[PDB]
Amino acid sequence: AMDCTTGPCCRQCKLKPAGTTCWRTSVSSHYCTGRSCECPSYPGNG
DSSP states (O other): OOOOOOSSSBSSSOBOOTTOBSSOSSSOOOBOOSSOOOOOSOSOOO
16 A cells, blocks of 8 residues: 555656656557556557
8 A cells, every 4th residue: 555656657656747658669669647657568558
């Protein structure tokens, strides 16, 4: 019970604005959700 997602789509225990990039690169193009800091394995998001 931390109530603070970690990893990409975050910033010091604070999720990034909805519609952010999840580490742009040629390894796996992804996006952020809006109310979380998780980077699913989907081709499209947000």
